[PDB]
Amino acid sequence: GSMSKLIELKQDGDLESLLEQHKNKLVVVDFFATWCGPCKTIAPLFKELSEKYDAIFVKVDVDKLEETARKYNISAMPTFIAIKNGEKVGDVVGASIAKVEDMIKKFI
């Protein structure tokens, strides 16, 4: 198998565990909320992107992983964070799939 797929995290500490062993991959994290309509709309498009690009695509419910949301300074949802080589490299704030793709192309 490959780690380049869409995964959905469960609890604080999961993202750290992922990044500990996949520092060389681009990781694109969709921080979303279940009370966020645009987050619903963009979810299938995020999955489509995950099928085209060799990056790790991660969904994080900000209410499930509250410490992780706080640590990445998330406010608006959805927020997409690009993470590579040990650090955050970019973000897209808001439900803009085109900008998310531009970010992936920039940093992959």
Residue ranges per domain, the chain? 1-108
Instruction: Report the CATH number of the 1-108 domain.
Output: 3.40.30.10
Which structure tokens are listed for 64? Answer: 């499930």
CA dihedral (24, 71, 60, 28) positive or negative: negative
> Method used for this model?
X-ray
Binding site residues for Ca(2+), as ranges?
48, 51
Binding site residues for Zn(2+), as ranges?
22, 108
What are the catalytic residues? Answer: 36, 39
Q: What is the resolution of this structure in A?
A: 1.6
DSSP string computed for 27-88: EEEEEE-TT-HHHHHHHHHHHHHHHHSSSEEEEEETTTSHHHHHHTT--SSSEEEEEETTEE
